[PDB]
């Protein structure tokens, strides 16, 4: 903080990362927000691209750890991430921004960011980061009405971790409320511990949406009582509004 | 804590002025941490400064300046920093104070540079609050004995008054004069202002206890003032310091145009004056050269 | 001294509001005078350390009655003002403060409030502030979140059924505000869904009680009634207009390709 | 020397713009 | 050829007061008068280091029809 | 105990980053021209 060297900023960026890490295991994460914000202005005014990228990522992780999704959105709206940043810092930024967009119903921009975060992720290490981004991208792609890639569930690293989401993706794809609710009642606790439960709940609309899409794609004229049966809705009157 | 400033910001649209004042005293403590959300509520905090009757309208300007400083809109940030008036303490070591100070000087410099070449009647008046802070900024170098730094900003902001003042109050006047002269020709590419710098540089040379006349004539060739050169030389004969004018003339012939020297001869006419034009006409200087 | 006076003042607001016929404007003056006193007693403490908990416990209450009083007289800005301050005392200083009994009730009102004003993006953000467990268990939180899903999937039958099974009497105001929006949304589907629907057929679709309530709404929506008690919705003729080639837009795009091939040098 | 360094850098920056403008111009005519 | 050198010396050390003449000479269809503009830039901007003048000389050097 | 030493250095370091960017870019352009 006292020194103003130019090469030290590259060292400083790593120090700030571990400074948030020691408090991460201290479970405070709040006294660092003032330090991170104050140091971010010090880096931004000096055009310290390396420090500014790390400081912005750590703040987003700080905000997202406490579900301060409103606070984190404001910061990313005004602050500009360094274009000449490390690919490892671009990967975190694209994930953190993509997670924010997913909560704010900006699914289309979320999908692009997490896909970019996956691309910029290290090719041989950072398995855990790949898992977390894959888990959120599967939900967003399902939340966007698209279909997740079948290949990612086949990888040895992601196979066990993406299994609850593989069953959930299957339930959404067939577009039946009965199978979607079974996954939720079976893997609800896993999704909650995963930070993806709230985005899973909105998938009920997508299950109905894609189920209706298959109904029109297949039936030239279908009874509303039949539609209620194929979507496992409550009454044909409910299928009438849907 | 205080993870969301929505509650504090919510204390801004109440009709009780006391309620608003307390919220402002709460925002400034968290403006360095929660500026992102206040940035979407600035329009509710600049109206407080816009209101004339508000008790803390000067405080409202200061906090809005902090939000804009964090936001990066430095042009808007300084405009409210000047609105803070006395509450924007130039003596503070805070990053916000020093960053707005830098933006103020640059903004003042651009106006003065634009104002320098403008005609007098079209000269846009620089704001008094903007001039007052830079004058305190200029005084800091004089207080801190950083005379070379104060010389440069004086040239950038085209203020010859502070430029003149810095050289005189400086401990090493001859050294500062030489440093200023070297900058005046090597770095200044605006002739109309470079002449003004030399027009005051000649004044300091005149008011020196031992007037170093040699550099004066060099500066006067740049200014193209034969009348000044003839006058300073004519009084030199009256003051009996014939040695200096003898050296002065060889410097005129070496580094001045013949039209400049020709105009000096006529003024010299209007014994020793006859030998004086002998060097200026140059038929002596080539004689020593040819003899060399 | 000041804290004791404020606590005594709070009960007289508590006593008047608790009565079966609360005195709104006469509570409002008490409310306005109470917020000024809280200002001296560390209102919204910045980075609240181990200070006195009585002020923290107190200031949370006047906002709780304050937020609940705003909907009693049915004004929007007052509720946002009080709930925004109240949210600070719910999540920030929760290490010192205990879990408020009315906290989940008032948080659900805020969530249902955002739905009534269609600020659905803000609805999910404030929803993340609550733990994932009590979203699916707490009745005061389950009702708004399930109503958002019902609105999104089109379960307009359950949206109107949400009136009956509200979790508490405080939720009534925001439900009607939502139901006014639902009425236009239901009929908005009908113009694009039904090519003709019978007069009393749309009575239950629009959830209209008296047939007269259709007549005023019909002219407001400009529905040309037919002789056979049918509404003719022939409006799909305004297709995406594939009849026109967007030549300027296409010429703009093809030129850009040529630019990305030649301008590079 | 603090002002001189600032001004020397300013001229060096401005010269870099001149050099980078002439290189692009030369590349256009070298292709010709 | 003699005039081209002569025209430049008329406006020696004249700084920006030779802008009107220089642009007239540089746009001329005569190759020699275009050469006079180059010399005029040299004399009008001698020792000034004017990057605007250097910008003009470099432009003509790399993009001109006459090698002289 | 300084005047605009912080202000000057802020201006100087801002130019140095800009200068370094253009010198890197110019050397790329010069190599393209030389080839």
């Amino acid at each position: 903080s006292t020194q103003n060297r130019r090469a030290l900023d590259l060292v400083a960026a790593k120090c700030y990362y571990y400074h948030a890490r020691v408090y991460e295991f201290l479970d405070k994460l709040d006294v660092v927000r003032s330090f991170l914000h104050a140091r971010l202005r010090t880096a931004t005014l000096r055009h310290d691209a390396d420090g500014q990228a790390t400081l912005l990522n750590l703040l987003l992780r700080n905000y997202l750890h406490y579900s301060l999704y409103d606070q984190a959105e404001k910061l990313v709206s005004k602050s500009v991430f360094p274009e000449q940043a490390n690919n490892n810092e671009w990967a975190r930024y694209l994930y953190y921004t993509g997670r924010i967009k997913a909560i704010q119903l900006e699914y289309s921009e979320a999908r692009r960011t997490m896909t970019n975060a996956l691309r910029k992720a290290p090719q041989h290490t950072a398995v855990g980061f790949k898992q977390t981004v894959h888990k959120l991208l599967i939900v967003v792609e399902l939340l966007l009405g698209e279909i997740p890639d079948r290949l990612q569930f086949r990888q040895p690293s992601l196979k066990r971790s993406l299994m609850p989401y593989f069953l959930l993706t299957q339930a959404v794809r067939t577009g039946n409320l009965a199978k979607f609710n079974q996954v939720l009642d079976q893997f609800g606790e896993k999704f909650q511990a995963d930070g993806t439960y709230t985005l899973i709940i909105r998938l009920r609309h997508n299950v109905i949406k894609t189920g209706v899409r298959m109904i029109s794609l297949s039936y030239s004229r279908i009874s509303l009582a039949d539609i209620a049966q194929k979507l496992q809705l409550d009454s044909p009157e409910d299928a009438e509004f849907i | 804590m205080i993870t969301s400033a929505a509650g504090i910001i919510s204390l801004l649209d109440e009709d009780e002025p006391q309620l608003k004042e307390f919220a402002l005293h709460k925002l400034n403590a968290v403006v360095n941490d929660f500026w992102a959300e206040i940035s979407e509520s600035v329009d509710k905090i600049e109206v407080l400064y816009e209101d004339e009757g508000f008790r803390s309208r000067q405080f409202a300007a200061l906090v809005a300046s902090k939000v804009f400083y964090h936001l990066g809109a430095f042009e808007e940030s300084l405009n409210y920093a000047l609105g803070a008036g006395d509450l924007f303490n130039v003596n503070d070591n805070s990053e916000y104070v020093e960053t707005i100070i830098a933006k103020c000087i640059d903004h003042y410099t651009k106006q003065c540079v634009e104002n320098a070449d403008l005609p007098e009647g079209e000269k846009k008046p620089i704001d008094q609050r903007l001039e007052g802070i830079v004058n305190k900024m200029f005084q800091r170098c004089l207080d801190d004995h950083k005379y070379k730094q104060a010389i440069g900003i004086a040239l950038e902001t085209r203020r010859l008054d502070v430029f003149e003042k810095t050289i005189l109050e400086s401990n090493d006047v001859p050294g500062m004069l030489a440093y200023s002269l070297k900058l005046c020709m090597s770095l200044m590419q605006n002739k109309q202002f470079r002449n003004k710098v030399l027009r005051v540089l000649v004044k300091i040379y005149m008011n020196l206890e031992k007037p170093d006349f040699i550099n004066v004539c060099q500066c006067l060739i740049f200014l193209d003032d034969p009348q000044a050169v003839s006058d300073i030389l004519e009084k030199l004969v009256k003051e009996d310091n014939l040695l200096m004018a003898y050296q002065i003339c060889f410097d005129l012939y070496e580094s001045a145009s013949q039209q400049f020297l020709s105009s000096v001869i006529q003024n010299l006419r209007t014994d020793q004056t006859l030998k004086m034009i002998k060097i200026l006409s140059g038929e002596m200087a080539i004689e020593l050269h040819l003899q060399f | 001294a000041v804290l004791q006076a404020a606590t005594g003042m709070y009960e007289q607001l508590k006593g008047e509001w608790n009565r079966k016929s609360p005195n709104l404007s006469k509570c409002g003056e008490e409310l306005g005078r109470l917020k000024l006193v809280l200002l001296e007693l560390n209102f919204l403490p910045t980075t609240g350390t181990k200070l006195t908990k009585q002020q923290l416990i107190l200031a949370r209450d006047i906002l709780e009655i304050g937020a609940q009083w705003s909907i009693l007289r049915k004004d929007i800005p007052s509720f946002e003002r009080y709930m925004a301050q109240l949210k600070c005392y719910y999540f920030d200083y929760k290490e010192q403060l205990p879990e408020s009994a009315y906290m989940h009730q008032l948080l659900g009102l805020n969530l249902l409030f955002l739905l009534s004003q269609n600020r659905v993006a803000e609805f999910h953000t404030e929803l993340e502030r609550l733990p994932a467990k009590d979203i699916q268990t707490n009745v005061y939180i389950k009702h708004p979140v399930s109503l958002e899903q019902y609105l999104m999937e089109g379960s307009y039958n359950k949206v109107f059924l949400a009136k009956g099974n509200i979790p508490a009497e405080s939720y009534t105001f925001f439900i009607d505000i939502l139901l006014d929006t639902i009425r236009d949304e239901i009929a908005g589907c009908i113009e694009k869904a039904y090519e003709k629907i019978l007069f009393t057929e749309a009575t239950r679709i629009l959830f209209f009680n008296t047939p007269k309530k259709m007549t005023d709404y019909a002219k407001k929506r400009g529905w040309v009634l037919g002789p056979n008690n049918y509404y003719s919705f022939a409006s799909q003729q305004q297709k995406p207009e594939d009849t026109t080639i967007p030549s300027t837009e296409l010429a703009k795009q093809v030129i850009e390709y040529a630019r990305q091939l030649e301008m590079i040098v | 020397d603090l002002y001189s360094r600032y001004k020397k850098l300013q001229q060096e920056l401005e010269f870099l713009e001149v050099q980078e403008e002439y290189i692009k111009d030369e590349q256009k005519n070298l292709k010709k | 050829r003699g005039l081209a050198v002569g025209i430049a010396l008329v406006m020696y050390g004249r700084m920006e007061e030779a802008d009107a003449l220089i642009e007239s000479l540089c746009r001329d269809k005569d190759p020699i008068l275009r050469r006079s503009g180059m010399y005029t830039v040299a004399m009008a901007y001698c020792g000034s280091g004017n990057n605007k003048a250097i910008r003009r000389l470099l432009h003509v050097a790399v993009s001109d029809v006459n090698d002289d | 105990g300084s005047g605009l030493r912080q202000y000057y250095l802020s201006k100087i370091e801002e130019l140095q980053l800009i200068v370094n960017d253009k010198s890197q870019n110019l050397r790329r352009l010069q190599a393209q021209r030389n080839e």
Side-chain angles (χ1 to χ4, degrees), chain A residues 33-236:
Chain A
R33 200 127 81 231
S34 270
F35 181 84
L36 273 146
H37 268 282
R39 192 75 21 211
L40 198 132
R41 269 297 93 75
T42 282
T44 291
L45 298 196
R46 179 161 326 81
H47 303 244
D48 161 19
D50 258 34
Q52 185 198 333
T54 302
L55 285 161
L56 209 47
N57 287 349
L58 289 171
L59 266 186
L60 292 196
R61 159 175 208 78
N62 216 237
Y63 281 130
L64 262 48
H65 182 278
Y66 292 94
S67 311
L68 277 35
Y69 287 101
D70 188 8
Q71 271 333 286
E73 178 270 355
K74 269 104 154 65
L75 179 63
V76 309
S77 156
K78 343 294 299 185
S79 62
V80 156
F81 195 75
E83 185 80 13
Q84 62 277 50
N86 194 10
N87 276 12
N88 309 109
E89 289 317 308
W90 261 109
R92 307 166 199 268
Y93 181 69
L94 290 162
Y95 160 76
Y96 287 131
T97 279
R99 165 153 271 273
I100 291 168
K101 260 134 181 43
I103 307 283
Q104 320 252 47
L105 308 168
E106 277 199 81
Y107 300 137
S108 162
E109 311 70 328
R111 179 171 84 95
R112 170 179 44 81
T113 47
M114 328 210 59
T115 315
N116 265 85
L118 264 206
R119 209 177 302 119
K120 273 164 162 302
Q123 310 217 185
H124 297 318
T125 170
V127 152
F129 174 74
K130 295 184 182 87
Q131 285 168 18
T132 285
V133 174
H134 266 284
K135 296 222 235 293
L136 200 43
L137 185 52
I138 285 160
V139 184
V140 169
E141 287 210 344
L142 289 162
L143 268 189
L144 245 180
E146 298 186 11
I147 35 176
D149 231 345
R150 184 56 180 87
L151 189 300
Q152 75 210 269
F153 307 89
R154 201 166 326 274
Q155 309 320 51
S157 41
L158 315 182
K159 204 268 216 311
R160 179 77 68 99
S161 56
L162 298 186
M163 182 58 33
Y165 297 74
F166 171 74
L167 267 69
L168 171 129
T169 297
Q170 269 177 352
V172 177
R173 222 193 66 261
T174 86
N176 164 208
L177 290 204
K179 314 137 185 282
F180 172 70
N181 291 10
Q182 181 264 127
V183 157
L184 254 178
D185 308 6
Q186 215 174 257
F187 299 120
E189 298 206 13
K190 164 64 83 43
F191 298 149
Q192 288 163 11
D194 253 19
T196 46
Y197 182 84
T198 44
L199 297 144
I200 284 324
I201 307 330
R202 326 168 182 186
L203 268 193
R204 109 177 308 270
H205 172 48
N206 282 99
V207 163
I208 279 168
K209 216 149 55 63
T210 196
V212 162
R213 196 121 40 75
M214 305 189 324
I215 286 268
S216 85
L217 206 57
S218 148
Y219 292 93
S220 181
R221 185 159 36 199
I222 194 179
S223 156
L224 279 152
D226 265 19
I227 285 186
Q229 186 264 343
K230 316 214 145 283
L231 308 188
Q232 284 311 256
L233 304 181
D234 310 29
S235 66

Side-chain angles (χ1 to χ4, degrees), chain A residues 67-69 103-105 192 197-198 201-202 204-205 208 234 238 240-242, chain C residues 120-121 124-125 128-129 132-133 135-136 149 152-154 157-158 194 205 207:
Chain A
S67 311
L68 277 35
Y69 287 101
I103 307 283
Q104 320 252 47
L105 308 168
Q192 288 163 11
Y197 182 84
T198 44
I201 307 330
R202 326 168 182 186
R204 109 177 308 270
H205 172 48
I208 279 168
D234 310 29
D238 251 4
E240 161 134 47
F241 295 108
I242 283 187
Chain C
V120 50
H124 292 100
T125 63
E128 292 283 322
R129 305 225 64 161
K133 192 51 41 185
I135 270 166
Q136 89 157 349
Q149 317 170 27
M152 228 208 308
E153 58 212 64
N157 162 340
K158 274 86 172 293
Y194 292 106
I205 309 301
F207 294 85

Side-chain angles (χ1 to χ4, degrees), chain B residues 4-60:
Chain B
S4 174
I8 287 164
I9 290 176
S10 75
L11 258 303
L12 256 45
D13 78 329
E14 283 85 328
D15 36 358
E16 174 48 53
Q18 180 177 30
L19 283 165
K20 316 156 111 52
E21 284 144 16
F22 163 77
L24 293 190
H25 279 80
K26 274 289 188 180
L27 269 195
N28 78 317
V30 293
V31 71
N32 319 59
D33 259 30
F34 300 89
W35 50 275
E37 30 173 359
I38 316 161
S39 148
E40 273 137 26
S41 307
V42 280
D43 77 323
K44 292 144 83 270
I45 207 183
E46 32 196 353
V47 52
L48 260 53
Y49 161 72
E50 220 170 311
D51 173 40
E52 305 48 36
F54 190 49
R55 186 36 202 128
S56 292
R57 61 99 46 92
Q58 246 162 49
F59 206 123

Side-chain angles (χ1 to χ4, degrees), chain F residues 2 4 7 13 15 21-22 24 28-29 33 35:
Chain F
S2 291
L4 301 322
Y7 163 74
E13 276 274 56
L15 292 172
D21 180 14
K22 281 180 138 65
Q24 223 84 37
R28 185 193 46 91
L29 279 177
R33 171 254 181 217
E35 158 90 29

Side-chain angles (χ1 to χ4, degrees), chain C residues 108-174:
Chain C
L109 268 158
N110 157 293
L111 285 166
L112 174 63
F113 163 60
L114 303 159
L115 294 195
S116 35
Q117 339 276 342
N118 207 17
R119 293 169 24 181
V120 50
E122 310 190 23
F123 172 83
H124 292 100
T125 63
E126 299 277 359
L127 176 89
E128 292 283 322
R129 305 225 64 161
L130 291 104
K133 192 51 41 185
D134 44 51
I135 270 166
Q136 89 157 349
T137 84
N138 196 290
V139 202
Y140 301 120
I141 282 313
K142 180 177 181 177
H143 176 278
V145 63
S146 96
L147 190 52
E148 205 279 322
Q149 317 170 27
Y150 290 170
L151 182 44
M152 228 208 308
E153 58 212 64
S155 284
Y156 298 118
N157 162 340
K158 274 86 172 293
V159 191
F160 282 91
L161 258 281
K163 176 79 64 43
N165 54 346
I166 61 63
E169 196 27 70
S170 316
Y171 285 42
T172 165
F173 179 35
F174 296 143

Side-chain angles (χ1 to χ4, degrees), chain B residues 2-8 10-14 16 18-19 22 26 29-30, chain C residues 35-36 39-40 42-48 80-81 84-85 88 91-93 129:
Chain B
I2 166 62
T3 50
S4 174
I8 287 164
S10 75
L11 258 303
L12 256 45
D13 78 329
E14 283 85 328
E16 174 48 53
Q18 180 177 30
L19 283 165
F22 163 77
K26 274 289 188 180
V30 293
Chain C
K35 55 174 47 153
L36 277 188
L39 248 61
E40 294 88 72
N42 225 327
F43 186 28
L44 310 116
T46 292
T47 60
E80 326 178 60
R81 177 193 332 291
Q85 285 144 48
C88 267
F91 310 110
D92 287 286
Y93 332 98
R129 305 225 64 161

